[PDB]
Design a protein around this ligand. Sequence first.
Ligand SMILES: O=P(O)(O)C(O)(Cc1cccc(-c2ccc(-c3ccccc3)cc2)c1)P(=O)(O)O
Ligand SMILES: O=P(O)(O)C(O)(Cc1cccc(-c2ccc(-c3ccccc3)cc2)c1)P(=O)(O)O
Lengths: 218, 214
Amino acid sequence: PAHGCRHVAIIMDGNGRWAKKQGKIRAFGHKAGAKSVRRAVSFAANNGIEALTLYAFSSVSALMELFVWALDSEVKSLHRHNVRLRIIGDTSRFNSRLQERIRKSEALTAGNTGLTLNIAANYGGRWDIVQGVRQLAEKVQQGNLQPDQIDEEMLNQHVCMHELAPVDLVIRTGGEHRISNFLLWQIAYAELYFTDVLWPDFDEQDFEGALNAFANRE
Amino acid sequence: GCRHVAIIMDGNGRWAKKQGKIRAFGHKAGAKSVRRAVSFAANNGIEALTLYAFSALMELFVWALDSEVKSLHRHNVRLRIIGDTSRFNSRLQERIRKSEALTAGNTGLTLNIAANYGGRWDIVQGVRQLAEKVQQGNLQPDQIDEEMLNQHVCMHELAPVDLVIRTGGEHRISNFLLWQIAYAELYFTDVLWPDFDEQDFEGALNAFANRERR
Ligand SMILES: O=P(O)(O)C(O)(Cc1cccc(-c2ccc(-c3ccccc3)cc2)c1)P(=O)(O)O
Ligand SMILES: O=P(O)(O)C(O)(Cc1cccc(-c2ccc(-c3ccccc3)cc2)c1)P(=O)(O)O
């Protein structure tokens, strides 16, 4: 599309600060944050973005259960919106019901032709590089791979989201200017966009602002 | 307290053109800004300063080493070059090795110059080392973890990078440090490298300080 942006990653932060400023509890901030997630996803779909990767930053094993569990009611709506869903992160420690649910959801939306929405859950950028590395170590132990044949491009095939367009833009709301171990390998050439807007208030116009920044930046 | 600053020095050529001068002029001013930045870091107890030049130079590299290494040593600065130097000519490689050997025991600022460096390359050199230990048999694929990999990436022996500064206007890491900046504060300034001075540097350090608090 015109903005030249195919894949956007967002570090969502500030829901709690937002609530507290309103004199409200964290639950209120979560309702507002989900509403902002729904709006950012439709915005992305309606604007020709191919992939949207979302990371919720928290101001632990159970939390990442709730989080991904909530996303369950959302699956049907997402499917109906022709969105392809994927969960990225270490879910190897999640009970196998979730892992099946997760794979059902991924199976279900797998053939949709709209926005590919990647949701981070128990994700870490270093972990991501590590699992890809383990995968190369296996091929070594099997005598199929020679250490010296290992290059960037090869490791690149084993990190999360290798099959999607490379990340063009990473937006971080909430005021902090750090990656906080979200994508690392994948952001080597991405435009980085930091805004003080808290996630609950980040809307279509804020998203347009980031895309135009990227459009003119490149 | 900011212990290790990494800087993506960008803007020399664009700067030259603004003055109506040739590229070589920007370089000259570029190198003076490096001198000033390194003095500033040493002058303020920063443990490590890592410099990445973002874009013959092999002979000039020999010259920067032969000419400045003596002063850095006198300033108790420990010098290290990071990146792929395996293909530079052997004389430059030797010069790099001696300069490093000469200042290795210094205890002041450790100045890391990234030459022919890339963040992905850096992670891959570490991976290859770990693959060797697997091929041999003294490492099980699933024994590999974050800590282990971290022990084979450049600068693992130094304080973790706290602040990455990119001058020149672009808002990208451009395949500079990747594994190492997972928790680093990122500071972008439109100031062109030749104009980046003590005040600009402190501004970034202040940003780090103030933000570290809030
Ligand atoms: O932004 P924070 O750090 O204040 C916090 O809300 C965590 C958080 C960050 C970003 C996004 C979200 C969030 C993302 C998604 C949803 C959501 C989405 C769909 C359905 C239900 C709930 C709710 C909340 C939560 P926390 O739980 O740490 O107060
Ligand atoms: O413990 P509860 O039942 O009070 C509540 O937190 C449940 C909840 C609803 C929506 C989202 C979340 C939630 C969102 C995000 C995260 C999270 C995100 C990133 C890292 C760690 C934790 C954890 C939990 C939790 P609620 O939103 O109803 O206050």
